[PDB]
Amino acid sequence: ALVVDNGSGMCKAGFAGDDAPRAVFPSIVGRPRHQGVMVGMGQKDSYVGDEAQSKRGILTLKYPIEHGIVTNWDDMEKIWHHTFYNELRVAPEEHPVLLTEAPLNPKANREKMTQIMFETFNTPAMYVAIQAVLSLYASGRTTGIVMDSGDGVTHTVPIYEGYALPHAILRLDLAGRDLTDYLMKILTERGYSFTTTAEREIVRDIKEKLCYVALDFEQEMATAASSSSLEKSYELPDGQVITIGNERFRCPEALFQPSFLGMESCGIHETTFNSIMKCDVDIRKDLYANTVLSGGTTMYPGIADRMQKEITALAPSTMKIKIIAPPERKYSVWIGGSILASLSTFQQMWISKQEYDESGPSIVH
Amino acid sequence: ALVVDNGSGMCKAGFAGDDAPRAVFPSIVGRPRHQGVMVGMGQKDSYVGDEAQSKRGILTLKYPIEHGIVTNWDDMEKIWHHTFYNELRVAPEEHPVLLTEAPLNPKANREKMTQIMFETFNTPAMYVAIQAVLSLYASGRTTGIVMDSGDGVTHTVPIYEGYALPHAILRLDLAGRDLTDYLMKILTERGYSFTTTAEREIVRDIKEKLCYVALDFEQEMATAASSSSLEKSYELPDGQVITIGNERFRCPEALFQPSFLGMESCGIHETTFNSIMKCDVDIRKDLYANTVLSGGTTMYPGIADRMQKEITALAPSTMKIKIIAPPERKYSVWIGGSILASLSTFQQMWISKQEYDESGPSIVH
Amino acid sequence: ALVVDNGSGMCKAGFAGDDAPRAVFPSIVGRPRHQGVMVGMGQKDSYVGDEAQSKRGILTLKYPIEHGIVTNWDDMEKIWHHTFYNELRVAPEEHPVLLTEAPLNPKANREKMTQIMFETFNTPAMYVAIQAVLSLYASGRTTGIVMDSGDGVTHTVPIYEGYALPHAILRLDLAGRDLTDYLMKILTERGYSFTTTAEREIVRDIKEKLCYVALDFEQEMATAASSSSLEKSYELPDGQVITIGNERFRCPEALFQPSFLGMESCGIHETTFNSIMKCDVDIRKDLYANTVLSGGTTMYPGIADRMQKEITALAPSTMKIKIIAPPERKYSVWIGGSILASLSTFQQMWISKQEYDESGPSIVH
Numbered sequence A, B, C: 001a002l003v004v005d006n007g008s009g010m011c012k013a014g015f016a017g018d019d020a021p022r023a024v025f026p027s028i029v030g031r032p033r034h035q036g037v038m039v040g041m042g043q044k045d046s047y048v049g050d051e052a053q054s055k056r057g058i059l060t061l062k063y064p065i066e067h068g069i070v071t072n073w074d075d076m077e078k079i080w081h082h083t084f085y086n087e088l089r090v091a092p093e094e095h096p097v098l099l100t101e102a103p104l105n106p107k108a109n110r111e112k113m114t115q116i117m118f119e120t121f122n123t124p125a126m127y128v129a130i131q132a133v134l135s136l137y138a139s140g141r142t143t144g145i146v147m148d149s150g151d152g153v154t155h156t157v158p159i160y161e162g163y164a165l166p167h168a169i170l171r172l173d174l175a176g177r178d179l180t181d182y183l184m185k186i187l188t189e190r191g192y193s194f195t196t197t198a199e200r201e202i203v204r205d206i207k208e209k210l211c212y213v214a215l216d217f218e219q220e221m222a223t224a225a226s227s228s229s230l231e232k233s234y235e236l237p238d239g240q241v242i243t244i245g246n247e248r249f250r251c252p253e254a255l256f257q258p259s260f261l262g263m264e265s266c267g268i269h270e271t272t273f274n275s276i277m278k279c280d281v282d283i284r285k286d287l288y289a290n291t292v293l294s295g296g297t298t299m300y301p302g303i304a305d306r307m308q309k310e311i312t313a314l315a316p317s318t319m320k321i322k323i324i325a326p327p328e329r330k331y332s333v334w335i336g337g338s339i340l341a342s343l344s345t346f347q348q349m350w351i352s353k354q355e356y357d358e359s360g361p362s363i364v365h
């Protein structure tokens, strides 16, 4: 059976018989804006994130997915086509597939997504599973509160003894792309300017390399405003040097207290405490000291040691607080997908073609 | 032969060849309220007070027994199944059993209870015995007035020279569970709130730990309203501190003068005097100075020294009054059950299978 | 004398010489989140529900009161200041005032509330009265069971011949704000999203306009899933149309069987039957057929005709059941406040300054 993590930002896919994905590519569809001045194939009508990442510049870049909701399904179907035929060389009619989505999403999403997945690609069996549950499979726990944070979605789910508290789930649409745009908007403080889609991938790669989360933001500010040498240099692809300072932390720190973005919500530590405070009074002792981090934007160095200091300053004292931040968080959800796909007891739960032929797309409910 | 104290509140069981029970667990059956988000065996259809006490939170809690009357027999049969197979590891067809009940109860109770006990578990021999009689066995007296007070039932039986006066027995359905709910309803005076079954066990454990009976309630009220330091603190399972004051006594004191509950009856001291005043005129001298306390809710510190001062203020003077409050009152009825089960002369009194095959369940009468 | 209904949600105030309040405004205090880019007076340090309702967007909105308990008294004192000086144009030192509260509340509330009311505003005389009693004044009955349901509190009080049974009162913290948040959490099923305080008032006004209570919820569900045209459209303040269907009832219906919210209590019909079953056996015949509904969230169309069908299915047959749902339920408690304030025989019951100068704030007891 195939496991495809159509999370936002990049697609990750492979077989359930493996410990890591076989494909990891940036989910972009890119289209040329200039005509072919010399005869050849070298100006295709469209490119997908495998090759559109390197032919950027002459291409505009648009994602099929935003805030975890698919905006144009033809781009997504093109990406699934690339994942099945071009990358894993596999006929989708041969293999069952399971697909990930955010916990709360417009229900029509699941309906269209399955209608495509086995009316067009005619896959034999299908199942949709929420990412936070799959992350626990990857950790192998049965009690815990999972936090996920990727491109444009953050959410949390409490689970105890394998039971989720659906009244205690939260979304918080703050992570990633809304945080890259802040880097774009703060980096113009130095003077550098970045205006276009292909040029944004530079700012993304900057953020993926030159970023750390301060444990005491006020004192890092007081240090970087001193004579301290804290800057590092980045070479742009044309050879222009970039120096970054007073910014390597002041970007990711806006994941906490997101009033810097004018988002009037509570932040990641607040919504972690405010999710545990929705659970029953004796569940707190076992969700505390089992906080599990997941997903790309949890990868900055120093996250866990700040988050722990924030929660411990906020939760009632005389309670053990531990944050389970493993490595490989980027793949955690796919690993758990491979696990759940492999468990023999789960094999009765797939929606088969026979069910959909009776019920149609609302069988997902 | 087995002795099982299926009194209300918690089940206590063991062999007659012992001085204390081998099992003591809260008689609860608990059921999940949330569907399964994660795969496993870890969510049985039902749990019993051994594990439902710790898996509370994810469970609703319902007792099979209320006011000493069984409300749902399938929950009780599940508890007997747990006591025989799971807890005492004993084949019920091997051993006779004796079972306790309240003195006055709907007769259909005894009928169903024995029908189950040796039509289903097919026990070889059976007997039902009233708790107050069994308590005298535990004290070893043959003259006395016994008071019992447990989860939801209080009653009294006078016995002289081993004879009970059935015209002088009283029930008074005031103890225990109706007194925890009053703590729940008075503790909201501080501001704390407790709404649900699992959360009530916290208030029960509070009551089991932070309670004392005032000898001069009016003066303890006048003291706690003074500058006196009289509060104590309880840590909830989440680490929230609770402070309790002007309440640690004002809860159990409602066992006397139950007009605080709007129950228009007389109270425990009144119904003790009003039971002795039903006995013959020369029996008073020997029921006085042989008052025997029994059952859980007689365990609060200061009970006996109040009760003596109340009865002595009410009974005619120039009479010696003594209250036999031993330790181990919690087990007293089970101890007496073990005694009566051990006496060889009693061994002719069990109802055998041969009797029931003639008479059916009404053979208990 | 003034009558101020400082119930939760919105403040309603006026003179006892009137049949309806003179002020009705949403009790919000709002504070700016942005520094001044343009010169003027137009950004006060704080605003109150008169103007903070229209300057929302640029304001954060916080209530002083939640679950009927005041959380920050300075916001409340600011609201009382606005009601006396700014709205009713009245010197508080001239007039006695009576104030409403929920039946069970932390006692410190009444103490602080009166300390403020005539240590700061220096009112000459003061009295606190429970809302359910005041509702009977508005109906003019002397026997009845009153149900109240507003912003964040529901409770019930039985009264017979003008006497309440304090052992039979219940709170049930389910109404209103916990039911708007459910609309926020169910409306994301369509795809629309609402994240912030000012934006929540839109969902509240939706609920106040596009809501009805189904008499047979299962059949309305079966109808809305058909081809039936049952949706209605709401225009947002920006002109975005919203269509709502299969939801206009599935929100308020969660006031019954609140397991949809994961609140493990019984619901409004259950706690109405379970309150009458605490009264004496001959009172039932006269509390039945005098159930009186009160307070805002009882205003949905179809409530009464469902509630009657629920109670009649549950109460013993051959009993007349009638629900007294008058119009003007929103003002009922204030009307009764005006009545009780006007009765000359009541005029001895106010706490005067002379009493408080001896007793301090606990004179309310």
Ligand SMILES: Nc1ncnc2c1ncn2[C@@H]1O[C@H](COP(=O)(O)OP(=O)(O)O)[C@@H](O)[C@H]1O
Pocket: A005, A007, A008, A009, A010, A149, A150, A151, A152, A176, A177, A204, A207, A208, A209, A295, A296, A297, A298, A299, A300, A330
């Ligand atoms: N090394 C890194 N450290 C921190 N964040 C990263 C790193 N690499 C990628 N990211 C973040 O993750 C995004 C890539 O997609 P991601 O959100 O991880 O999708 P998914 O969660 O589905 O894997 C990047 O745009 C970036 O915001």
Ligand SMILES: Nc1ncnc2c1ncn2[C@@H]1O[C@H](COP(=O)(O)OP(=O)(O)O)[C@@H](O)[C@H]1O
Pocket: B005, B006, B007, B008, B009, B010, B149, B150, B151, B152, B176, B177, B204, B207, B208, B295, B296, B297, B298, B299, B300, B330
């Ligand atoms: N240490 C204690 N002091 C006072 N009361 C107690 C104590 N422990 C238990 N109780 C009361 O006894 C109840 C336990 O069941 P109980 O009524 O004793 O049943 P039984 O009488 O059948 O043993 C508790 O709910 C509590 O009300």
Ligand SMILES: Nc1ncnc2c1ncn2[C@@H]1O[C@H](COP(=O)(O)OP(=O)(O)O)[C@@H](O)[C@H]1O
Pocket: C005, C007, C008, C009, C010, C149, C150, C151, C152, C176, C177, C204, C207, C208, C209, C295, C296, C297, C298, C299, C300, C330
């Ligand atoms: N027309 C209406 N129909 C149903 N419910 C309403 C209506 N108007 C207001 N409400 C409910 O009443 C709330 C307003 O405050 P309310 O609870 O009535 O306070 P009070 O009971 O003190 O007047 C609103 O938030 C809403 O939940």
